[PDB]
C-alpha cells in the first residue's frame, strides 16, 4: 500500500552551555532508519535499521556531509529567530523541522511536506501545492518573503516529487523484509475486579506493525467511545507497537462487551469477547 519517508530535525539552544543540540532522525513509515546527534562522538549519520546498513560508504559520507550542513543551518536559524522575536540570549529555544514524501499504493508521489516550528508552534510550512508558503506570524512572513525571493519552494518541490520518492522506493525494495511487512497484533483480554460489583476488561494488541490500529469496545454492538480508556500506541522497542483499550464493566455483564481490532496485518477485523 501507501508509504512515507520523513526526516525530523530538532535544534535546541543551550545558552552558556556551548553549541546548540541538534538531532536528526529519519523514518520510513514507522521504522526509524538513521540518526545524527550533535553530542555523539562519531559526528556521522548512523544506521538505526538493519536494511540501511547495506548502503555503502558513499551513502554514509554523503548523508553525513548533508546532515552537518543541516546542523549548521539550524545553528544559524536559532540566532535569527532570537533576533526576530527580540528574545534574550539567556533562554533556551527550540527549532523543529520535518520534511518528506508520501507515495500511494501505486508507489507514485502522492504528497510532500516541509515545515518548521519554533518553540513548539508552527512557524512556516510549504503548502500541499509545493509552490506556496503558510507563515504563522509576522516573523515567519519575513522568512516567507526571503524564501519566495530565493525560489526555495521550486528547489524543494524538485526534491519532494523526485529525489525523495526515489529514495523511498529504493529503501522499500532494499528493506523489503522490514518495510513491506505487516505484523498482525497478538490480542488478548484481561479481567480484573475493581470492586465486588465491577471489573475492568482490558483489550490488548501486541507486537503489531505498522503503528496504525483501531481498538474499540462495544456493548450490545454499540460503541462505548465515551467510556473506553484508550492509551497512546506505544513502541515495544523491537520495531513493533502495543496498545490497549479498557472498559469498566458491571460484574455479571462481561458477555455484553466485545472488543474490536482493526489492523492492516489482519485477514479480517477481530472480535474478542470475555469468557
Amino acid at each position: 500500500g501507501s508509504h512515507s519517508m520523513r526526516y525530523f530535525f530538532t535544534s535546541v539552544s543551550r545558552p552558556g552551555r556551548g553549541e546548540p543540540r541538534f538531532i536528526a532522525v529519519g523514518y520510513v513509515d514507522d521504522t526509524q532508519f538513521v540518526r545524527f546527534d550533535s553530542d555523539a562522538a562519531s559526528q556521522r549519520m548512523e544506521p538505526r535499521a538493519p536494511w540501511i546498513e547495506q548502503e555503502g560508504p558513499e551513502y554514509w559520507d554523503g548523508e553525513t556531509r548533508k546532515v552537518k550542513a543541516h546542523s549548521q543551518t539550524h545553528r544559524v536559524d536559532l540566532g535569527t529567530l532570537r533576533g526576530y522575536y527580540n528574545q534574550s540570549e539567556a533562554g533556551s529555544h527550540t527549532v523543529q523541522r520535518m520534511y518528506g514524501c508520501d507515495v500511494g499504493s501505486d508507489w507514485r508521489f502522492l504528497r510532500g511536506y516541509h515545515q518548521y516550528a519554533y518553540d513548539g508552534k508552527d512557524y512556516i510550512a510549504l503548502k500541499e501545492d509545493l509552490r506556496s508558503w503558510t507563515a504563522a506570524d509576522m516573523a515567519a512572513q519575513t522568512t516567507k518573503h526571503k524564501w519566495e525571493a530565493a525560489h526555495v519552494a521550486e528547489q524543494l518541490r524538485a526534491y519532494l516529487e523526485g529525489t525523495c520518492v526515489e529514495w523511498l522506493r529504493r529503501y522499500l525494495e532494499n528493506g523489503k523484509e522490514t518495510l513491506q511487512r505487516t505484523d498482525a497484533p497478538k490480542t488478548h483480554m484481561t479481567h480484573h475486579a475493581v470492586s465486588d460489583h465491577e471489573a475492568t476488561l482490558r483489550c490488548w494488541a501486541l507486537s503489531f506493525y505498522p503503528a496504525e490500529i483501531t481498538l474499540t469496545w462495544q456493548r450490545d454492538g454499540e460503541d462505548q467511545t465515551q467510556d473506553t480508556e484508550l492509551v497512546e500506541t506505544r513502541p515495544a522497542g523491537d520495531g513493533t507497537f502495543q496498545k490497549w483499550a479498557a472498559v469498566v464493566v458491571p460484574s455479571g455483564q462481561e458477555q455484553r462487551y466485545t472488543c474490536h481490532v482493526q489492523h492492516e496485518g489482519l485477514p479480517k477485523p477481530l472480535t474478542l469477547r470475555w469468557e
Partner: peptide, 9 residues
C-alpha cells in the same frame, strides 16, 4: 536520503 541543499530562515 536528505536534502542536498540548505537555506536559512
Amino acid at each position: 536520503g536528505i536534502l542536498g541543499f540548505v537555506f536559512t530562515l
